[PDB]
């Protein structure tokens, strides 16, 4: 007789990924679940490999545990990462070979009709990196890799194995190990769509629902609408925290209501931060006049230009002007009001005291993360600082510049889209330096040109009142002003910290400094 | 042996486990001198052991002892004729040459990627048992597969076979059913799923669908100049195929920016029907130090030389060598290597063509690269409204009334732009409303023109 | 000595294999000493066994330093005039300064890529048996072959 | 465990000094499935163990194997339910989101200079030992100390 491998599996343990399980199933398990009457008529070698690559989360190792827990093969020999490695030579490789030994023994003594053996490499990327250039010319990992791939597709013509691998960086693995015959299927499981997410958030809730818990008010459809890119496991983290909140609620028959509403703000996500904006917009936005609305509705225009369009997956925009004029803030407000899942900032603030190469890497990371998701509006702040430019002498960071520029010129994968933003205080150096040509367009953000604008800015802010405001308006009559408001606010408080006698005169005496 | 299995922590047994190999045959050689039955050996991934003895940079390993022993035992003081050592590696240059000289390993024959004929045999074997046991349908003969398989190598060739039969197997099996119920039906043919899964299997050489990023929107015949360009490209490319003594050829597709040089470069690469193509571009290599960038470029060309034929597309050279107009700074190593490789002659009649692109000729003329390029091409962007609106028709947007509305303004006047910019212009104008769309487009088009 | 086979895990055995290598020789030295056996040893691939006294080649464990025992047996206090050792290397400079001098290793000389004359002579030796046979090597012109084949050796 | 102390230069020991922390509790899982007692782990300085792993290159991969190990341990194929892991540091931005994601390290916390109010309770504790003795009473009021000490930890 022959024993069927899976025996009782019924699509339980996971959700969100059905096409992917099917594309693994037909490749790997179809030859193993089939009448072997005609399989030799067909002359097929059972495939010997599966690979999983993706971001943190997204349920790959759950998939791999499911296949091997549900199946009746009952012979899983998981490797935990670099556990192979040992100080003494020969042990590192032989620790590999004592995995395959049992299977090779079975195959030798029992033949083609045989059981299954599974090996599950967790974080394969550490032990197996590309031979030839690694931590020096030779490197340490040549031994284990040449042993592994000499063995899987080896001289022995062994079948009766399945090698599952997991990683986060699929590029580091070598083509000699990734080509067909050793590891065929390299899946790209990534953040799910709302339909998949609902399956996830239904199965993690069914164990609550089987018993009468979770009062009927909660609707998982709304949750799937307002949790577009939670990167998987944050969903069950949300549910666990919701359990916790209901739990410490009923402390002197608990239920979970509006769990998403309570949890969503508290839980950070791989996608957008809920609100990390306060550093950039701490004091809010006061529109003094028409240019604010102009730049901003231009922004939302250019936004819907991405979603409602094809054949231009990215549009990059510089929004520049004189210094101290809210260039970063307008970018942030565009991003906020635009309702984008992947909004992120690349501020040089975060990257300081870094060599330009590490700066480059911390800038490419976020664009790769954007290439993951469907939509995004990334913003680069203070480019003249991000790529350091000093007027005294011409010195700059060539590498970061070139990376940034080609990243503007980078067509993302089919279907995905970007709304890259960039700020500068100076545009002439870019006209020298070719950056502007890459950008689609430019959005000037003028300083406060007229006291007529300034006065309504002040009443909008609400610090001064009609009596003194009359005096200031009278003094500014007819004259033109050249002032950035991030400097204005400073002058405001530097005024308010003097007594009312010389309050306004200190204000105006400081104001007349700029004068342009 | 599986290569490193020989090595063990204890000292002297590491090489004793080698001595155990030939100590099974030297006895036969001793007692039956000539008449013996050919003890043999099969190594695999031999590079780990048996590399050059001065490998202590990073290795710091006793493997010197190993290679010295084996190098000694094969030729040795004792002569033993009935020994065959078979050795195989993907990285041959690391070996110690002393074991590789004749007498120890004389035949160093290296296999090559299967040609478009031989892959017929490769596929024919794996289909022979099928078509003998009356599985496969008759409508799909293997030539239709072979001519479509450009750079499939070996396991990559049989992968589509196994996967296609697996797909035909999968259809019968069928989700949430307690059992996956294989309806026991003998009828399994595998008709066109091979032609499907040619989609699914990328090889290393070329990926026919990796052109979407470069050519997103295809090619639009706005005018006669692009036809002239592609004509020059094709009649320049028949050169290599149908010539000798010009095994490398070198061109440049220069022009003003936002004109789409790379796109029609890749279209030339397609319509040439070469086996091997590459796009050596910075979009993959970013933040790479100059040495890594140059060694990537050399990996591209050492992959190409394997092939009988090859084309490469160098994309945005100025960015490849990180040119900057002010305080001119330029990757010296990358420039020098890129320049040498233009005039590197492939060893045995191999044919290669290079398609360079950039926005500017002046820097290359100052860097002494233009004459290194054999013959160059200009890409005149749209200089005229009568060409502009023709391209606009070939797109289809800005329908007839809008066409006529802008026709008066641009029919008798200059317009000097590229179509990369044109696409973005029309997309931006299209958003707000039909009535406001044309005056937006035109005021924008007059804003860009300086 | 087909490369290193003296090395073994149990320390003292690697050092002590050589006494077994020299024992019969020193026996013939002491007993029946005047006219002697004149025993020889080949000791191929010194590049493995000898090194720069353990200082170089990374941290070579003291198992590696069997050179000390070899030195003491060949020219130490007890002396031998009845045996000669031979050496064979591809990388002589890796050997320590000590052995190469007289008394231990008296004669050193490369075997060079031979000239056209020697290449003719060696090719003649290999072809000679066939040429002796009536039906072989017709029109071979080994002197032409020699001048053609430039660096083959 | 202090991060800087488990890193041994000799490869394998650095990563294999971690699995010991989990092995006893794993054996407890083998023996008692779901009703086992906790096993708490305290990484006193984690940012030396863990840093952002290198990407898309052979270089910049130094000291990443340790992370690839413990990430595999705490949520791997052997689903290990009985351990709560502590981490504590002063540089929360060096560490992977791969590690900070739910299931490995659920929650991040901030603890900073307590305030005069916090100091007051600290002083209640460390004074209260003496209060238990009752010797240390000199009409010393704690508000003097609180309002005097503003930044102290």
């Amino acid at each position: 007789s022959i024993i069927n491998p899976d025996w009782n599996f019924e699509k339980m343990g996971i959700g969100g990924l059905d096409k992917e399980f099917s594309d693994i199933f037909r490749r790997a398990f179809a030859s193993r679940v089939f009448p072997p009457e005609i399989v030799e008529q067909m002359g097929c070698k059972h495939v010997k490999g599966i690979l999983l690559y993706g971001p943190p989360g997204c349920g790959k190792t759950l998939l791999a545990r499911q296949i091997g827990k549900m199946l009746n093969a009952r012979e899983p020999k998981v490797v935990n990462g670099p556990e192979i490695l040992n100080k003494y030579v020969g042990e590192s490789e032989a620790n590999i070979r004592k995995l395959f030994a049992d299977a090779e023994e079975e195959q030798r003594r029992l033949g083609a009709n045989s059981g299954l053996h599974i090996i599950i490499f967790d974080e394969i990327d550490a032990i197996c990196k590309q031979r030839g250039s690694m931590a020096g010319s030779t490197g340490v990992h040549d031994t284990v890799v040449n042993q592994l791939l000499s063995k899987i597709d080896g001289v022995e013509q062994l079948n009766n194995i399945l090698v599952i691998g997991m990683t986060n960086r699929p590029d580091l693995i070598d083509e000699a190990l990734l080509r067909p015959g050793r590891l065929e299927v390299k899946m790209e499981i990534g953040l799910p769509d709302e339909k998949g997410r609902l399956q996830i958030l239904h199965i993690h809730t069914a164990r609550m629902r089987g018993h009468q818990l979770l009062s009927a008010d909660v609707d998982i459809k709304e949750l799937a609408v307002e949790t577009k890119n939670f990167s998987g496991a944050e969903l069950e983290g949300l549910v666990r925290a919701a359990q916790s909140t209901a739990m410490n609620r009923h402390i002197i028959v608990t239920r979970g209501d509006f769990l998403a509403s309570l949890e969503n703000d508290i839980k950070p996500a791989f996608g957008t931060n809920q609100e990390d904006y306060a550093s950039y917009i701490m004091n809010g936005i006061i529109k003094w006049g028409d240019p604010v609305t102009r730049v901003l509705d231009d922004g939302e225009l250019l936004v819907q230009q991405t979603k409602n369009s094809d054949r231009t997956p990215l549009v990059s925009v510089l929004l520049e002007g004189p210094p101290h004029s809210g260039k970063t803030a307008l970018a942030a407000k565009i991003a906020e009001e635009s309702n984008f899942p992947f909004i992120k900032i690349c501020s040089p603030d975060k990257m300081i005291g870094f060599s330009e190469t590490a700066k480059c890497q911390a800038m490419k990371k976020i664009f790769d993360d954007a290439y993951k998701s469907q939509l995004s509006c990334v913003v680069v702040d203070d480019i003249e600082r991000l790529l350091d430019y000093v007027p005294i002498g011409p010195r700059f960071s060539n590498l970061v510049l070139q990376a940034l520029l080609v990243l503007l010129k980078k067509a993302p994968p089919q279907g995905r889209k970007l709304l890259i933003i960039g700020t500068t205080s100076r545009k002439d150096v870019l006209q020298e330096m070719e950056m502007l040509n890459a950008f689609s367009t430019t959005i000037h953000v003028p300083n406060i040109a007229t006291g007529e604008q300034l006065l309504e800015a002040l009443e909008l802010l609400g610090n001064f009142k009609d009596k003194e405001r009359t005096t200031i308006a009278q003094q500014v009559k007819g004259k033109k002003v050249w002032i950035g408001i991030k400097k204005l606010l400073m002058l405001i408080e530097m005024s308010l910290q003097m007594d009312p006698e010389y309050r306004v005169r200190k204000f105006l005496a400081l104001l007349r400094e700029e004068g342009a | 042996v599986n290569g490193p299995e020989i090595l063990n922590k204890y000292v002297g047994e590491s090489e004793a486990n080698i001595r155990k190999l030939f100590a099974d045959a030297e006895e036969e050689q001793r007692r039956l001198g000539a008449n013996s039955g050919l003890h043999i050996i099969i190594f695999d991934e031999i590079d780990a052991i048996c590399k050059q003895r001065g490998s202590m940079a990073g290795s710091t390993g006793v493997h010197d002892t190993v290679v010295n022993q084996l190098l000694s035992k094969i030729d040795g003081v004792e002569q033993l004729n009935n020994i065959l050592v078979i050795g195989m590696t993907n990285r041959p240059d690391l070996i110690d040459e002393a074991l590789l000289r004749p007498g120890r390993l004389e035949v160093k024959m290296e296999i090559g990627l299967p040609d478009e004929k031989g892959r017929l045999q490769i596929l024919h074997i794996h289909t022979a048992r099928m078509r003998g046991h009356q599985l496969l349908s008759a409508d799909v003969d293997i030539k239709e597969l072979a001519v479509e398989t450009k750079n499939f190598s070996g396991a990559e060739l049989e992968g589509l076979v196994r996967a296609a039969q697996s797909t035909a197997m999968n259809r019968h099996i069928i989700v949430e059913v307690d059992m996956e119920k294989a309806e026991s039906l003998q009828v399994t043919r595998g008709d066109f799923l091979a032609s499907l899964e040619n989609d699914i299997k990328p090889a290393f050489g070329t990926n026919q669908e990796d052109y979407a990023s470069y050519i997103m929107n295809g090619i639009i015949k706005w005018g006669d100049p692009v036809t002239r360009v592609l004509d020059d490209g094709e009649l320049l490319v028949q050169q290599t195929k149908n010539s000798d003594r010009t095994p490398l050829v070198s061109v440049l597709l220069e022009g003003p920016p936002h004109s789409g040089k790379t796109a029609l470069a890749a279209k030339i690469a397609e319509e040439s029907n070469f086996p091997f193509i590459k796009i050596c571009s910075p979009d993959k290599m970013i933040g790479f130090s100059e040495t890594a960038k140059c060694q990537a470029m050399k990996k591209i060309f050492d992959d190409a030389y394997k092939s009988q034929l090859s084309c490469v597309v160098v994309d945005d050279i100025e960015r490849l060598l990180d040119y900057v107009p002010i305080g001119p700074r330029f990757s010296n190593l990358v420039l020098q290597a890129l320049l040498v490789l233009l005039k590197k002659a492939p060893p045995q009649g191999r044919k290669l063509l290079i398609i360079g692109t950039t926005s500017r000729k002046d820097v290359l003329q100052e860097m002494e690269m233009l004459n290194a390029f054999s013959t160059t091409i200009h890409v005149p962007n749209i200089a005229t409204g009568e060409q502009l609106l023709e391209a606009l028709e070939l797109l289809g947007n800005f329908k007839d009334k809008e066409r006529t509305t802008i026709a008066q303004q641009v029919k008798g006047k200059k317009v000097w732009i590229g179509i990369k910019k044109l696409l973005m212009l029309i997309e931006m104008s299209l958003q707000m409303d039909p009535e406001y769309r044309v005056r937006k487009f035109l005021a924008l088009l007059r804003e860009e023109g300086a | 000595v087909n490369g290193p086979e003296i090395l073994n895990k149990y320390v003292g055995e690697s050092e002590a294999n050589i006494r077994k290598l020299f024992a019969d020789a020193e026996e013939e030295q002491r007993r029946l000493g005047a006219n002697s056996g004149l025993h020889i040893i080949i000791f191929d691939e010194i590049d493995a066994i000898c090194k720069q006294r353990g200082s170089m080649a990374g941290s070579t464990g003291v198992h590696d330093t069997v050179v000390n025992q070899l030195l003491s047996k060949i020219d130490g206090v007890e002396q031998l005039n009845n045996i000669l050792v031979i050496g064979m290397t591809n990388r002589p400079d890796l050997i320590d300064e000590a052995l190469l001098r007289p008394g231990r290793l008296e004669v050193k000389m490369e075997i060079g890529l031979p000239d056209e004359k020697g290449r003719l002579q060696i090719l003649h030796i290999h072809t000679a048996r066939m040429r002796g046979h009536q039906l072989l090597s017709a029109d071979v012109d080994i002197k032409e072959l020699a001048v053609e084949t430039k660096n083959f050796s | 465990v202090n991060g800087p102390e488990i890193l041994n230069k000799y490869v394998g020991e650095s990563e294999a000094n971690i699995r010991k922390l989990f092995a006893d509790a794993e054996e407890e899982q083998r023996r008692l499935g779901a009703n086992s007692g906790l096993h708490i782990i305290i990484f006193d300085e984690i940012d030396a163990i863990c840093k952002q792993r290198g990407s898309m290159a052979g270089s910049t991969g130094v000291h990443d194997t340790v992370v690839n190990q413990l990430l595999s341990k705490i949520d791997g194929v052997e689903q290990l339910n009985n351990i709560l892991v502590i981490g504590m540091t002063n540089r929360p931005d060096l560490i992977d989101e791969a590690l900070l994601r739910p299931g490995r390290l659920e929650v991040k916390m901030e603890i900073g200079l307590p305030d005069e109010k916090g100091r007051l309770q600290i002083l209640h504790i460390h004074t209260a030992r003496m209060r238990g003795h009752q010797l240390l009473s000199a009409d010393v009021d704690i508000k003097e100390l609180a309002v005097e000490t503003k930044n102290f930890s």
Partner: peptide
């Protein structure tokens, strides 16, 4: 770093009476 410090050890006890 000085990586690939892989080293090997030898028996010297050979316990026997």
């Amino acid at each position: 770093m000085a990586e690939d410090a892989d080293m090997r050890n030898e028996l010297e006890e050979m316990q026997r009476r």
